[PDB]
Amino acid sequence: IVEGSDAEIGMSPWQVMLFRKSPQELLCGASLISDRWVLTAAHCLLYPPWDKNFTENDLLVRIGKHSRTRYERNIEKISMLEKIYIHPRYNWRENLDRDIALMKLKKPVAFSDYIHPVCLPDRETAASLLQAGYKGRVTGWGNLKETGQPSVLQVVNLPIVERPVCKDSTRIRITDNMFCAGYKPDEGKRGDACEGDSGGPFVMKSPFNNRWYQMGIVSWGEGCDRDGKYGFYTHVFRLKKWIQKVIDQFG
């Protein structure tokens, strides 16, 4: 996260770290959606241009974390993957369309003060909140700058951007399964996701029921916090049918 701030303790209890076993390193962010299911970006698990194709056994999920590097004894829980599910129409060749993946955990994780699932939006939630100018929140342990690493989880609040503005900022073909967020040059305020924040949640707090919903998944950008560029997010509600199908079949 570029131009964010240190998270408060328990501020993002659904935040998940995807951790590579060997070499031991941060792979991506992710989110907890129930006691056995974790959501992330497909490109965290499968991206042939970079020779990325992880299997279950290559990764661990670490839940309830704050410190990036510390083993948070008595606070974090480390879980093993039972199965990975990548959207079958994930477009890694072109534009990261449908950049979404689910991971089923071997055992349920116990909820705590630091570990708790985020809600997924329904149609009404999406319609009311996914509006230009409405702000959401993005969190992760990714780079602090484009071209280093935070000691603790970082947070930044960013406004959703009008679709014509998103399209005009980029040469990538934008789809309905994506939205963009970030401040414009004239707005003065800054912030963006960066390398290692991928797969992390973009969340909004409903003013109707005061619950946090995951509206987006950190998907792609062009640099980090560059003037005139925006961060792009997987549109969670647009893919909820696939999410539900997977959970209904395999849960």
């Binding site: 909140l129 929140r137 619950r211």
Partner: peptide, 27 residues
């Protein structure tokens, strides 16, 4: 269920330092 309600915030009626900025944007 209890999704989206944080033990250290919503469940205790404590607000985090910047959630108000989100609310103020929901115009």
């Amino acid at each position: 269920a209890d999704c989206g309600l944080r033990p250290l915030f919503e469940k205790k009626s404590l607000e985090d330092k910047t959630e108000r900025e989100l609310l103020e944007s929901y115009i």
